[model samples]
Target: ETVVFVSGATGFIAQQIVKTLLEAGYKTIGSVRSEEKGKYLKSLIESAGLNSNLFNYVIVKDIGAKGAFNEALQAHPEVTVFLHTASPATFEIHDVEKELLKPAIEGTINALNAITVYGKNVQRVVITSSYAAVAGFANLATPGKEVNEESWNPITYEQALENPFLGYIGSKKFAEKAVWNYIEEKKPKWDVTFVNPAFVLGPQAFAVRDKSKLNASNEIINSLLTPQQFVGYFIDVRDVAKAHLIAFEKNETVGQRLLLANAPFSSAGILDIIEKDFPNLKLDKSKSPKFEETESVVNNEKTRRILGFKFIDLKKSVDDTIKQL
Candidate 1:
């Protein structure tokens, strides 16, 4: 029996991962920040008509605290995989280190350390990394950059401190770097795989009590409600979830970073599709997003070839996400 422990168990992306794991008959231990959140996800899983016993939740309130997951891992002796997806995803920040960097970097280190010490049965730890860790968005201001898994975001700690949004990008870059460093120097018992997805998009399977609490990436979609310009690489949330599962299972993915960008994406392109498909939503059609001018591209051939992933089309992704909205 495959037993998996997922951090940020109630998050937008993590919830999808939990659903996928439960459906595949894997035993799941979701690390939640609160009992209510945990119960909510548990109920959500049950409502999906899957076996409730196959999934359980552990309270891990502080992901950045020392030994944050220690007791939880000790309690779940059967867990074989630790998936770390917990961290602040929002761009808003009052303190750079406290809000963005610490929870991200320390949370990663804390999870790894706890797993190393307590997760005796674990074999692999798959982490959710962002394209922010792989490519510098500053590259966009200039032009022409072909990004790949090996690419590292050029933002420095100081540079990140200057802007709140850069702090978010820096948080991912630095946090992922720390995970790699821990893997190398500490040399824990388990192997590790990193999933670096571009802006993740898709519909939510678990319902949120407040739509305001939607996934961080959904802010990009909500931006469409007001108006124009946007540019970035993107992948469906379902594909991102699949990549984590594939990375955990595939030997070829061990010690490798799987980049999940299917194509260069623009907000205007999504708006055009939404206008044609769901005009009842009454979105702005006057301005075309300037994605055509984007000079950035990600090489997803490695992810596709190695994981055997077929990315969903932009129209279909937007359409599906809109259905839920």
Candidate 2:
């Protein structure tokens, strides 16, 4: 009953979504890079007191490598739903074709091939895309401009691949473009769904010794707990995962990119939540978390309209993140 496969099963966002799905009794298959982590997550899920049969894990090839997913699907051919959530996300941007673009394109092609060639039972295909793909770098948003689904990265061809973060964005854009190109070229029987979520932050259920959390990219945990800078723009991880599920479930979700962003928050805005919720932490009320200077934002109309999703308000995501700290 409703067999689902989530790629990058243990990545921050993908792990959150897989946990939510497993809790709901969806028979799920998750992919990780290694047998060790894959089996560990297996024990973690079994410990939750649910039927262990509802979840299974496997190692997909270097998802960035071409034809990796093809081999993955061959090993387990029963999946009917696919969520390609794995991407090489890092603040470390690089040339598009070399570092960022190749993996994204190959991994996506791997996802489609897994089903198209091996398991044709696929009914819905959902992937995590970014607002960066929809609208790139805000200054590029038309003067007096609205940023929404119609907008594409304003960076030129050269600049698009040059800036690492921009290259990451273009990677998603091109992959999304390639996915549809294949779908239209072959006119597959299934539906195509895209979740265009913005900056994700929130608490995780468990902590690991390994590197995790985008906030951790700058040693952000302690600072956010004791807030040192101003920052705006966030989507709660829960909200993002919930939107992913709803997008996958809704029949009308086909051929849509749903944006999930809380309204932009300023440093002062976050302090208000920190003070109100976590009064014990000594945070500077005057400053915001250092904003990621290179990212883009998007409006949330399509998510609510198409996926019937609800987003956490800006204050709630910030406050929730602080609570995690």
Candidate 3:
């Protein structure tokens, strides 16, 4: 049996990955910060009618710690595939270095170090990175500049300190760069792949009991309950989860960065869909701004051909997410 290990088990994207793995018959182990969170996730899986014994969790309180994953990997000798998805994605920040940069870089390195030393049976390590790592935020407005899997965000550490947004962007770029640096320097036996998705939006893998709190990306759609201006590329959360599995199973995805994005979305466009679909909500369409196309050009044709699947469109993604709420 193939055993897969996923860090940050309770997260929005990671939860979907866990469910997919269990459904696919892979023995899955997820790392959460506490027993309470682990129990809740396990209960969710069991309630979904999945085999309880097929899924388990390990406590990893601080992913940035030097040996955070060492004991876990040592104990779970059967784990052959490692998926690191634990990095923080929040924009709420006080200290840029402390809150975002340090943890992201350290956590990635820590995972690599632990896997190199303890993951005896491991064959692949797939990282859950973001489009922030692949797109140049500063050059998004530059005409005719196409961003693809090979693109890199040019933000430096000094520039990142200016604000929380840059800090989060820089965190992803530096953390992902650290992975390539480690691979080039050490050349571990296990190969690596990266799954980079634009703003991920869709229903939770399981029902979300609290409507007030949603994951960051989905929160953008939730904020549309009130009129606002927002524009960016998007991909369904389920598609992103599927990319992780494909990256793990397919040799063609090895040492590749799979970019997951369907299309550009604007708040006005989303509101139009909401007004058409959920007429009961009675959202004020008058205050909604005009739809604006995203300036950046993203080409993921190579990613599409490799994954061999069509992405979920914005309207359907919005429809599914709204149903959950």
Candidate 4:
């Protein structure tokens, strides 16, 4: 079995990704910057009855420091598949802005740099990027023109400097650009692709209380029952995680950005579902992602055509999330 290297196994998305890999019988070396965090995930994966021996942990405390991640793969040279999903995303995006760009960019570079050390044995690198890298402006590259992987941030650097959201887009875009740059310069001995799933929602694989990754998971689940609030396109955690494993095995998945998106829906559209199916639960519109439509929404045909992935429907994603909650 191929031993996959995964970062961000602590978050909801990474947890599901790890579970899928473990259940599929692939050995995984998931990096957790801390021993405590790594131990927690090991317990969770083991508790789920996955083979404990198949999973190992490398503690690379600083994700963005120059050579932190490089040491991780050096220690576990047997790892072949890499999943980069350790970007720090907390609930305080409204006013947080220290070390975001450098950490995110340097972290991507550091992770890819590790593969250079491993040479060609590292078959593929699956980087977890976001739709925000492409769609982050009011008119992010004309609405009806079919924006797929070809679409990029039309917002200028000055525009991004002025706005936090645009700056976040800049960070992701630049980090991805850095990955491609390294690939071009060194011509790494392996296939590299990005898994760009839009504002991911749906059921979480773990139970979260307090302020956790579950906050994002919970915000999305509860939003499904509320009315009037609208938001960006969403996909289920299951669909997104499954696509990761599939990409590692797909020949056509190389050197591509697999954009995963679902059909449009609003919080009100969600309320209609709850009111019709389960009328007893009352939902409040507050506690949810901001209802923004025009700026979000990227056509995800490339991922479907190349990898042939079918994302979960909006309601199915939402309903599954609610059930898990």
Candidate 5:
């Protein structure tokens, strides 16, 4: 079994990635900031009937710091796969540089630097970037075009500086580009695959220790049945996690950014589902789906064919999430 090093192992999607790896019989060293957090994940793993022995945690409190993952890599020389999933994935932005840009880009650079300097056995590094990197969330919908891996966010640094939303999108684009530039210039000892996903919605693998601490994506789930209108491409969290695992081992996926968008979603549709299944739950039925969504052309047939992945539908995605709630 291959040894994989997963940064931010306890994150919303990272937990699912670790869960997939553990169940797939791979040895994983997931990074966690604190012992308590690590222990919680370990207990969750044990409860899920996965072998906790095959999984370990390393302290990497700050991913953006210089040589952040160096010591961890030094301790785990057996790591063959480096999965970088450590970065802010929220909308809170007080300072663009401090809150978004530097952390995303610098964290990626630090991990790659560590891998280059210390990870001798590393064959591949998979990054958990966002669809925001490939296509801006604020992009107006072009009826005929759908965003894909080939698409790139057109937002620039100057534009990002003008708005926090653009800054978030720009952060992903620049950070993901940093990985590509590192590969081209340094020609590292390993290949890289970027998994760019949009609006990931599903039940979390572990119960929340604190309701207030739910991830940014999961928090959006509560608003699905609200009067607020929403429109965007979305995917199940479980499927997004599967995409990361597939991208890691597949040879054809080595130098590509796989966009993990399953289907376009509408908040009005979610309200209908909620009303049909649990009529007792109060929902804002008066509201209808409206608003703008990304319009870049997307071709995901290659992903399904190349990685042999069949996506989970929106109904199942919404239903599974409800079951967990």
Candidate 6:
């Protein structure tokens, strides 16, 4: 049996990836921040009727720390595939570099370093990068520009230090760049793949007790309870999870970035869906702003051809997420 190591097991995307891996019969070990999180994840898997023996967790408290993954990799020599989904994704920032950039870059480098030294059997490494790494502020500024797998965000570290939004974008770009740079410089034996998804949306794989505190992406939908401006391409969290597995299993995806995006969405569109579906909730439609369509076109044809699957539609994605609340 192939053993896979998933970092940041407690994260919204990471949890779905773990569940997908478990269902596929892969012996999976996940790294969480604490024993409490680990226990919760393990219990969640058990509750899903998956074999508890097939899943385990180790605590790697601070991913930003140097050699954070060293101990975990050393302990699990059987691990042949590593899926890294451990970067910070919050917008609340005091220091952009400390809060966003450092952890992302350091966490990626540490994973690569530890895997090179300790993961002897590892053949493939898949990093959960974001679409932010593909399109930058410049790309968005231009109207009708097509963004595909090959597009790269041109924002530099200096530019990233200006604000939290740019900092988050830079974090993903730099972290992913670090992976390629490491492979080129060190020439590690294992190949690498990147799964870059646009603003991910969907229900949590497990139950969410606190509906108020949803993951960043889902919270965008949740926040639609009031009027707001959010317009971008979105992929279902379930689709994103499946894309990770597809990236691991498919050899064609090696050294390739799989752009996972479904359709462009605007806040007004989401509000319309909510009002239409859940009329009893009584959200005020008059408060909604004018529906503004996103300008840039997303081209994920390569990813679609490789994965050979249909993405969940926006209406259902919204319905599923709201149902969870």
Off by over 4 Å in 4: 89-98, 118-120, 139-141, 209-213, 223-230, 285-298
Return the TM-score for candidate 4, rounded to 2 decimals. Answer: 0.87
Instruction: Please report the candidate that would top lDDT against the real structure.
Output: 3
Q: What is the C-alpha lDDT profile of model 1 across 253-288, one tens digit per residue?
A: 888999888877777777778788986876665554
Candidate 4 local lDDT, 140-188, one digit each (tens): 5444455677666666545655556566777777778788889889888
Query: Each prediction's Cα lDDT score?
Result: 0.81, 0.70, 0.87, 0.71, 0.80, 0.85
Model 6 regions lying over 4 Å from their true place: 89-94, 138-140, 285-295
* Model 2 whole-model lDDT (C-alpha atoms): 0.70
Candidate 1, 173: how far from true, in Å? 1.0
Candidate 6 is scored at a TM of: 0.94
What local lDDT score does residue 106 receive in model 6, on the 0 to 100 scale? 79
For model 3, residues 1-325, the per-residue Cα lDDT tens digits are 6899999999999999999888888899999999999999999999999987999999998777898999999899999999998784555689999888888998899889999999989999999988988876744433346788998877888887777878888899899999999999999999999999988999999868678778878877887763346676889999999899999999999989999888887777788899899989976554545343334688999999988888889989999999988
TM-score of each: 0.93, 0.85, 0.94, 0.87, 0.93, 0.94
Candidate number with the higher lDDT (1 or 3) = 3
In candidate 5, what are the lDDT values of residues 1-325, reduced to their tens digit?
Answer: 5999999899889999999998899999999988988998999999989989999999888777889889998899999999988784545678887777877888788888989999989999999888887765554335456666678877776677656777777888899989989988999889999999888988787776654435666555566543346777788889888888998888999888888887777777766777787767766645544644334556678776766868888788778777766
Q: Count the backbone clashes (under 3 Å) in each candidate.
A: 0, 9, 0, 1, 4, 0
User: Which regions of candidate 2 deviate over 4 angstroms?
Assistant: 89-96, 205-223, 226-232, 283-298
248: Cα error in model 5, Å: 1.4
- C-alpha lDDT of residue 136 in model 1: 68
Poorest stretch of ten by lDDT in candidate 2? 210-219
